[PDB]
């Protein structure tokens, strides 16, 4: 087995035990176990180039140590409309620790609620988070703008 390195707009890094046969599906995967980010919002860019999920990472050019981006798949205060742009809102579905509290509200997250991700991975109630971003388009925890790329 060997290790690679996934790292999120905050500059967090995560160390995944995998495989060279590996498919991108299944690094999603254990990045989901390890992070609880389900697989259809994680968009992995390696060297400057999206990663397609079929495909093992032994075809991309992953060799021990490598360190892939994990941005958001995406189709001064922030309208609603811009808020929907550069975030995921998806309702919750806990994962089968597998706890996730909002911290904004300190609730835990529970099936089916309304909930959004943002650019740097952190996960929030909407109605919570909405209500800073029409303040201000930074995340509350790590301060990233929710319109950074790269
Ligand atoms: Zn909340
Ligand atoms: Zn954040």
Same mark, same amino acid.
């Given at each position: 087995?060997?290790?690679?390195?996934?790292?999120?707009?905050?500059?967090?890094?995560?160390?995944?035990?995998?495989?060279?046969?590996?498919?991108?599906?299944?690094?999603?995967?254990?990045?989901?176990? +390890? =992070?609880?980010?389900?697989?259809?919002?994680? &968009? %992995?860019?390696?060297?400057?180039? /999206?990663?397609?999920?079929? @495909?093992?990472?032994?075809?991309?050019?992953?060799? +021990? =140590?490598?360190?892939?981006?994990?941005?958001? &798949? %995406?189709?001064?205060?922030?309208? /609603?409309?811009?808020?929907? @742009?550069?975030?995921?809102?998806?309702?919750?579905? +806990?994962?089968?620790?597998?706890?996730?509290?909002?911290?904004?509200?300190?609730?835990?997250?529970?099936?089916?609620?309304?909930?959004?991700?943002?650019?740097?991975?952190?996960?929030?109630?909407?109605?919570?988070?909405?209500?800073?971003?029409?303040?201000?388009?930074?995340?509350?925890?790590?301060?990233?703008?929710?319109?950074?790329?790269?």
């Amino acid at each position: 087995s060997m290790q690679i390195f996934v790292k999120t707009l905050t500059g967090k890094t995560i160390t995944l035990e995998v495989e060279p046969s590996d498919t991108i599906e299944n690094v999603k995967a254990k990045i989901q176990d +390890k =992070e609880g980010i389900p697989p259809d919002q994680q &968009r %992995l860019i390696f060297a400057g180039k /999206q990663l397609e999920d079929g @495909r093992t990472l032994s075809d991309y050019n992953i060799q +021990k =140590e490598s360190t892939l981006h994990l941005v958001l &798949r %995406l189709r001064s205060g922030a309208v /609603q409309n811009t808020i929907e @742009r550069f975030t995921f809102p998806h309702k919750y579905k +806990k994962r089968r620790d597998t706890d996730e509290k909002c911290t904004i509200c300190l609730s835990m997250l529970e099936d089916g609620e309304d909930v959004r991700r943002l650019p740097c991975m952190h996960l929030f109630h909407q109605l919570c988070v909405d209500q800073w971003l029409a303040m201000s388009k930074k995340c509350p925890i790590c301060r990233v703008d929710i319109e950074t790329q790269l």
